[PDB]
Amino acid sequence: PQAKYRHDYRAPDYQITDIDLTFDLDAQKTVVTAVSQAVRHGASDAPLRLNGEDLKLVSVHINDEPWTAWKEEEGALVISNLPERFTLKIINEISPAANTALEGLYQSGDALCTQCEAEGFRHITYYLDRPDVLARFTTKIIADKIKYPFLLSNGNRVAQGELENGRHWVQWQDPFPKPCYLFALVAGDFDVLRDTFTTRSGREVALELYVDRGNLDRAPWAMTSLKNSMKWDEERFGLEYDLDIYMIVAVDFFNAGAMENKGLNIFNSKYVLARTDTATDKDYLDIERVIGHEYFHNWTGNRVTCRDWFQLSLKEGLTVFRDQEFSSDLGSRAVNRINNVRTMRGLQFAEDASPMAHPIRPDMVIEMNNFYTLTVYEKGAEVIRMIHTLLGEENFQKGMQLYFERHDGSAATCDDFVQAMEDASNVDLSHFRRWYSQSGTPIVTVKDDYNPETEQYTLTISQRTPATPDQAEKQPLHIPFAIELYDNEGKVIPLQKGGHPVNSVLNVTQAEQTFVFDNVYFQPVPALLCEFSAPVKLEYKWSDQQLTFLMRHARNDFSRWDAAQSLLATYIKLNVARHQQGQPLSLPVHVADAFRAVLLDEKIDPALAAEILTLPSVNEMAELFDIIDPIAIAEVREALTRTLATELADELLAIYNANYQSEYRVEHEDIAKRTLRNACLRFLAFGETHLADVLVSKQFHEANNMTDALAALSAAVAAQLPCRDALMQEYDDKWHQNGLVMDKWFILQATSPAANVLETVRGLLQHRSFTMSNPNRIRSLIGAFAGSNPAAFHAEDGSGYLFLVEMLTDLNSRNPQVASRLIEPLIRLKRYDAKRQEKMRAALEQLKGLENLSGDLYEKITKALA
Ligand code: NA
Ligand code: NA
Ligand code: NA
Ligand SMILES: [Zn+2]
């Protein structure tokens, strides 16, 4: 359809203040009654345009009078000649069972449940579906007692009743005005885990976690995590929960990961259910993350919400920042930072090049569900971290405070949040605001000079953002640029300028500038962009010895990891160019020596050693190139792994045996050691075949937990070892009746370095555990093929592109949101060689031709083809 523009936001002509919903539930045909209290603010001649999608309108009343001055248009109900203040009453029917897109009210298994973010409440009743219209909800659900014993909506339960013919009803009331995207409804039969948490001030909150029956044994971690979140937000931000009850329901059929619906979060069951033999350490930490995340939304998203959808980052960048900080306090900050930066550089930077490039606050949007992006979430949070970096904790907290004090109870803008941070701190963020409106990844170039006569070090820093598909015009940003300077012994040299300390975060605000430091008593090795202080590409001409020096001496663990990625980047690029000419991998001795040194340093945190021995992902590697040869990258990763497996075999095995652990515990010291042990196992898989096949299958068979079971299975697949098919069948045989566990197996299948991986993947569309109606299964198999196996996806013959087009033809009609996730590999076409671009362009031109092309796909397809 047509685009919506941020600069066209105007306040609404009408407001709703209270809405009283009734649901006569039935999966075939639900009847919705909505009584809303409205107020005209605009002109008298302005009609009321209510949004609505695939609703069957039964009746319209205005102050109990059957209305005759209205009409239905494309996606709207238009009501005219209205009083200034009035009661609106709509009755409509919807059909949950038919809803395969999982927008609105749909069925997930036997259960009914909702997804309204961003614009799904309009698939339930005619409303002002925009998040600047906030109102007090009352929700009455009626349903078959047998099939739907639990009837849940937002708030507290305020009435209940039984009816003839085996039906019953519950009524719910949320005292906080909210935008309709935060409305939730759930009916079904569940096992319920109940605990309580008591707030800092005495308030006792009931906690109820709803799971499909028989899953009550994978619930406690989720619950413990929720409790930790409530405590952490209390300790770090001073934020207490505001209601008496907190519900979380885990469903299997869900497009997102989870949803901050006020008082009644709905979670993909992926980010709830864990048990030591079904879930890995990553799963546990992700559940901690997502539970936390939705919880933190209770302030940064609900108590203060978004005036319009272009302000999505207001809540998501801030709430992601909050889930990073939660994870980082409770666990390893260094590991957390490293991985979040892997994500920025690997995946986000790629999107900021792509035809979908947008600023964290978009200016144009066709389908809003396309803008739940790495950019809005992860880059959004980096922008928040930058603010935190410029202001410091004490100041940042005062801004949070002023933000809430001003906007609690309303919908706000990104600019409002920045103004709160500015006014509380008296740090000026006028120039900084440009981060909200400029797309693309800036490139910061650093040139250095030491003058021993004067004992001064000059940094010449310059910046440029190259043009993007979405903006022709770019300008310099306010870039917090952190530096440490190290002397010959590995001590930090103090920064100064004329006998006066200088702050180690520099304000790179111009296209080019120059910083001169004094009393620099020795020629420094610098650490640049410490802790990835801005979401930029750094360009500096490191010597390998500067890099290895930093791996040995840098204060900050992140700087050691990052020195290593820079060391290794050089050689990844070398060996890709070599691969392309039929040459074998070449690697200097001293490079392997550095990784050996990390493996044998007793001073090293195992967690860090583990991340330094985790090679960059293929996506992380691709960001190093202008043109991507996915096959060269894939083969080079495989080779580089083999070479270090050989060069480090004795030390790898030593460290593998050293960090054996008889007990399994989800505690961070233990996870660090298990991560390191399994990092060693990966390399060993790629070494001597018999020894490999022995360790891998032994670890798999003997593993007490899924982290170890799967690490070995995954290495058997990755390294193509003898036991593979057997181990792989064993897993199927055991876990096929369990979708979330099978997700891992599908990924392994889909990301196999095998020769006939596409043929296997087409076949797995028939597998017992697979189903095209379940977005988890789709992402696990098809998603992992297209997104995480770029070597097979970008086969020379175009067979990958055609497979995705077949799938997308199905998913376009069934679930556009998921089709849109899946097309992302294909809109990156302008990044590969001509021969590939042509086939990709052809695939996109096929999809453009679809009878009933969704807006979701249409938005991305016309940008890419443009
Ligand atoms: Na209102
Ligand atoms: Na709290
Ligand atoms: Na910590
Ligand atoms: Zn969120």
Residue 325 labelled as part of a binding site: no
Residue 616's identity, in one-letter code, is P
Taking the C-alpha atoms of residue 123 and residue 117, their distance in angstroms, rounded to an integer, is 11
Taking the C-alpha atoms of residue 759 and residue 742, their distance in angstroms, rounded to an integer, is 19
Name every residue whose Cβ is closer than 8 Å to that of residue 98 and which is 6 or more positions away in sequence: none
Both tokens of 711, joined, read 């690490």
Both tokens of 670, joined, read 């233990």
Q: How far is the CA of 364 from the centre of ligand 3 (A)?
A: 39
Cα angle: 406, vertex 409, 413; to 5 degrees:
60
Ligand closest to Cα of 133 equals 1
Q: Experimental technique used?
A: X-ray
3-class SS at 508? strand
Give whole-number Cα distances, 534 to 389, 503, 595, in Å: 9, 16, 27
Q: What is the resolution of this structure in A?
A: 2.9
In a 13 Å sphere around the CA of 392, the CA atoms on its Cβ side amount to 8
Residue 400 labelled as part of a binding site: no
Sheet holding 264-268, edge to edge: 191-198, 204-211, 245-251, 264-268, 258-259
Q: Is 472 exposed, middle or buried (0-12, 13-18, 19+ CB in 10 A)?
A: exposed
What are residue 638's phi and psi, to 5 degrees? -55, -45
Give whole-number Cα distances, 412 to 313, 385, 859, in Å: 11, 20, 27
Both tokens of 352, joined, read 């900021």
Neighbours of ion ligand 3 (CB under 5 A): 333
Taking the C-alpha atoms of residue 801 and residue 786, their distance in angstroms, rounded to an integer, is 9
Ligand closest to Cα of 179 equals 1
Taking the C-alpha atoms of residue 217 and residue 210, their distance in angstroms, rounded to an integer, is 12
Q: What is the largest distance, in Å, between two alpha-carbon atoms of the chain? A: 96
Residue 257 labelled as part of a binding site: yes
Residue 258 labelled as part of a binding site: yes
Residue 7 labelled as part of a binding site: no
Q: How far is the CA of 326 from the centre of ligand 3 (A)?
A: 9
Sign of CA dihedral 142, 148, 152, 153: negative
Find residue 77's DSSP bridge partners: 50, 72
The answer to whether residues 651 and 684 touch, using CB atoms and an 8 Å cutoff, is no
Residue 293 labelled as part of a binding site: yes
Q: How far is the CA of 713 from the centre of ligand 3 (A)?
A: 31
Q: How far is the CA of 620 from the centre of ligand 1 (A)?
A: 45
Total residue length of the chain: 866
The answer to whether residues 631 and 582 touch, using CB atoms and an 8 Å cutoff, is no
Q: How far is the CA of 405 from the centre of ligand 2 (A)?
A: 17
Both tokens of 732, joined, read 């199927």
SS3 content of the chain, % helix, strand, coil (to 5): 45, 20, 35
Neighbour tally for 196: CB within 10 Å: 12
Q: How far is the CA of 130 from the centre of ligand 4 (A)?
A: 17
Q: How far is the CA of 37 from the centre of ligand 1 (A)?
A: 9
Strand 443-451 to 537-539 pairing: parallel
Reference 781, options 757, 753, 746; nearest CA is 746
| Rg of the chain (C-alpha set) | 28
The answer to whether residues 143 and 169 touch, using CB atoms and an 8 Å cutoff, is yes
What are residue 857's phi and psi, to 5 degrees? -75, -40
Residue 316 labelled as part of a binding site: yes
3-class SS at 580? helix
Distance in Å from the first CA to the final CA of the chain: 16
Ligand closest to Cα of 372 equals 4
Domains of the chain: 11-190 (2.60.40.1730), 191-275 (3.30.2010.30), 276-439 (1.10.390.10), 440-541 (2.60.40.1840), 542-866 (1.25.50.10)
* Element of type H or E holding 195: strand 191-198
Both tokens of 446, joined, read 């650093």
Name every residue whose Cβ is closer than 8 Å to that of residue 464 and which is 6 or more positions away in sequence: 442, 443, 474, 476, 511
Q: How far is the CA of 96 from the centre of ligand 4 (A)?
A: 25
294 noted as active-site residue:
yes
Strand 150-153 to 134-144 pairing: unpaired
The answer to whether residues 416 and 509 touch, using CB atoms and an 8 Å cutoff, is no
Residue 539 labelled as part of a binding site: no
Both tokens of 38, joined, read 């409205």
Ligand closest to Cα of 200 equals 2
Give whole-number Cα distances, 311 to 371, 423, 629, in Å: 11, 20, 37
Taking the C-alpha atoms of residue 670 and residue 285, their distance in angstroms, rounded to an integer, is 13
Taking the C-alpha atoms of residue 11 and residue 149, their distance in angstroms, rounded to an integer, is 41
Residue position matching structure tokens 């193509």? 720
The answer to whether residues 360 and 383 touch, using CB atoms and an 8 Å cutoff, is yes
Taking the C-alpha atoms of residue 847 and residue 207, their distance in angstroms, rounded to an integer, is 46
Active-site choice (294, 325, 378, 824): 294
Residue 93's identity, in one-letter code, is E
Ligand closest to Cα of 605 equals 3
Taking the C-alpha atoms of residue 23 and residue 32, their distance in angstroms, rounded to an integer, is 5
3-class SS at 189? coil
Strand 411-412 to 305-306 pairing: parallel
What are residue 392's phi and psi, to 5 degrees? 80, 160
